[PDB]
Amino acid sequence: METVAYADFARLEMRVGKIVEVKRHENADKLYIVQVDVGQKTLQTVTSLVPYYSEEELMGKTVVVLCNLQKAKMRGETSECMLLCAETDDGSESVLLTPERMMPAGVRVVLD
Amino acid sequence: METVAYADFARLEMRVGKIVEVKRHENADKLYIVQVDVGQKTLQTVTSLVPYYSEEELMGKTVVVLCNLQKAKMRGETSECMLLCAETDDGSESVLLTPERMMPAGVRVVLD
């Protein structure tokens, strides 16, 4: 696609987060409500990733979230952040991004 | 900052890359030229990260790059991609982002 100014990257609020609550409705299927600790507040996202990852696997996991996306409703649940993943070219597998070493919840993602 | 449409995230070309060449000019200081394999092509960036990371440490490392930023010159060297990092709130330490598991060079970064 076309370039991209630095300003276009800057308008995004991306932070390291840690998953603190993973919720599965009883009547099921596909979606899970996830709470992500982003340092001084906790933001809700609706995922997506669970059979691929376990619920137990997601708990305490360090992740990367986009935090200033327009409020979204999915099946009536609010998504106010979204997890960043790398996905294979055929959509078969999606893997969460993470800082390569341990880092505090809430630290900003920046270009080097 | 203000929200953020999905479209604003979509205009960015972010991919998983692998560092394949790290170059240090003899007359020194701060900057290093890094080649990043992004699957079917290799893109140049100018970093930044080297004393913090070794050159040997960077070689073969899986990273995340923004690939469609306006061509930039730094000290006359072209930067045509930029590495994504998480940085502490005081700028003291910057850590490269990575998929949490091994993934091929070139796979796209997407929101879940």
Curated annotation (Swiss-Prot), chains A, B:
The keyword tRNA-binding applies. Transmembrane segments: none annotated. Residues 8-110 form the tRNA-binding domain. It comes from the Bacteria. Pfam families: tRNA_bind. InterPro entries: NA-bd_OB-fold, tRNA-bd_dom, Tyrosine-tRNA_ligase_regulator. GO terms for molecular function: protein homodimerization activity; tRNA binding. Keywords: RNA-binding, tRNA-binding. NCBIfam families: PRK10089.1-1. Homodimer. This is tRNA-binding protein YgjH. It comes from Escherichia coli (strain K12). The gene is ygjH.
